[PDB]
């Protein structure tokens, strides 16, 4: 969208609601694949609920945008190069937009809990500029996201279930290596509505499942070379006490000379699956993780799909 000007990025709408217009401050990338970040302090100290996200992205120039909640942005300037990092503390992902992926909307009555004693005090926006031939005119870009906040307690609360491999060793050559993740779910019900997969270049497919009475129910399955937005869960699924959450990342050892382990760099690999959920407010957890493989023998009946590329 056009460069806002000087209207004010905080718009109070009533006693309980306010819009945050979180936009780049007229930036002009000089090279392709630039990552720009900015932050905005939540303008209340008490608990609030993020209940809507409207993307304001120039189709021409923005490849993707991420919105994070945290307490300690990686820098304090109007904007900053953030190949490096977004937050010094944990970056909680709230929103992802990708040029060609269709953005999931929050289900009705769902919000992310922010502010107050334990919630995020800051939003950090990351904008990825790809092709920059649209900046030949040295024009200024004000891309970002318009966020709707309310102080009204929401009946459903959004969270993030992160499933992540730690021990995986990918030998050189080995055409096929599986990174398997599984945890017992022991909490009140979560309703899974979106997922995001992330690996590095050696990743062929990522799938996650809820397993109940030996039945595998697809949460999501994605080639991890495609853009990394939140894809909608095709048939949104309850995950309940006694279920097993199970994920498999399929890896190759080809194009590589030494053994590849898990690490933050691209020479290292990752197997991450982000599951966006909601829970009933009176039971809600904003975050859960699985870094174990508690039921490795259960993978003997994983569906065929998990082992074949798309
Ligand atoms: Cu991108
Ligand atoms: Cu990574």
Curated annotation (Swiss-Prot):
Function in brief: Bifunctional enzyme that catalyzes amidation of the C-terminus of proteins. Alpha-amidation is present at the C-terminus of many endocrine hormones and neuropeptides and is required for their activity. C-terminal amidation also takes place in response to protein fragmentation triggered by oxidative stress, promoting degradation of amidated protein fragments by the proteasome. Alpha-amidation involves two sequential reactions, both of which are catalyzed by separate catalytic domains of the enzyme.
Identification of the protein by name: Peptidylglycine alpha-amidating monooxygenase
Variant or mutagenesis effect after changing residue 200 to A: Abolished peptidylglycine alpha-hydroxylating monooxygenase activity
Subunit structure as annotated in this protein's UniProt entry: Monomer. Interacts with RASSF9.
The species this protein was found in: Rattus norvegicus
Similarity field: In the C-terminal section; belongs to the peptidyl-alpha-hydroxyglycine alpha-amidating lyase family.
Compartments reported by the entry: Cytoplasmic vesicle, Secretory vesicle membrane
Positions spanned in the full protein: 45 to 354 of 976
Region (Peptidylglycine alpha-hydroxylating monooxygenase): 1-310
Residues bound to Cu(2+) 2: 198, 200, 270
Highest taxon of the lineage: Eukaryota
Binding site for Cu(2+) 1: 63-64, 128
Disulfide bonds: 3-142, 37-82, 70-87, 183-290, 249-271
């Amino acid at each position: 969208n056009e460069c806002l000007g000087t209207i004010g990025p905080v718009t109070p709408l009533d006693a309980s609601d306010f819009a945050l217009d979180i936009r780049m401050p007229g930036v002009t990338p000089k090279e392709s694949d630039t990552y720009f970040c900015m932050s905005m302090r939540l303008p209340v100290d008490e608990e609030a609920f993020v209940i809507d996200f409207k993307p304001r992205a120039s189709m021409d120039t923005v490849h993707h945008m991420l919105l994070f909640g945290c307490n300690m942005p990686s820098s304090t300037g109007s904007y900053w190069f953030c190949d490096e990092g977004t937050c010094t503390d944990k970056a909680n992902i709230l929103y992802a937009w990708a040029r060609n992926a269709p953005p999931t909307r929050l289900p009705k009555g769902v919000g992310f809990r922010v502010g107050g004693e334990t919630g995020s005090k800051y939003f950090v926006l990351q904008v990825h500029y790809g092709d920059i031939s649209a900046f030949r005119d040295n024009h200024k870009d004000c891309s970002g996201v318009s966020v709707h906040l309310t102080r009204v307690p929401q009946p459903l609360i959004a969270g993030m279930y992160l499933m992540m491999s730690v021990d995986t060793v990918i030998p050189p050559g080995e055409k096929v290596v599986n990174a398997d993740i599984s945890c017992q779910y022991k909490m009140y019900p979560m309703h899974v509505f979106a997922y995001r997969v992330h690996t590095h270049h050696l990743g062929k497919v990522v799938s996650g499942y809820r397993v109940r009475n030996g039945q595998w129910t697809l949460i999501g399955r994605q080639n991890p070379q495609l853009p990394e937005a939140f894809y909608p869960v095709e048939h949104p699924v309850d995950v309940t006490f006694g279920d097993i959450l199970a994920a498999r990342c399929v890896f190759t050892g080809e194009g590589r000379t030494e053994a590849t382990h898990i690490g933050g760099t691209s020479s290292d690999e990752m197997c991450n699956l982000y599951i966006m959920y909601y829970m009933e407010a009176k039971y809600a957890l904003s975050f859960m993780t699985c870094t174990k493989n508690v039921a490795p023998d259960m993978f003997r009946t994983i569906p065929a799909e998990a082992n074949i590329p798309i």
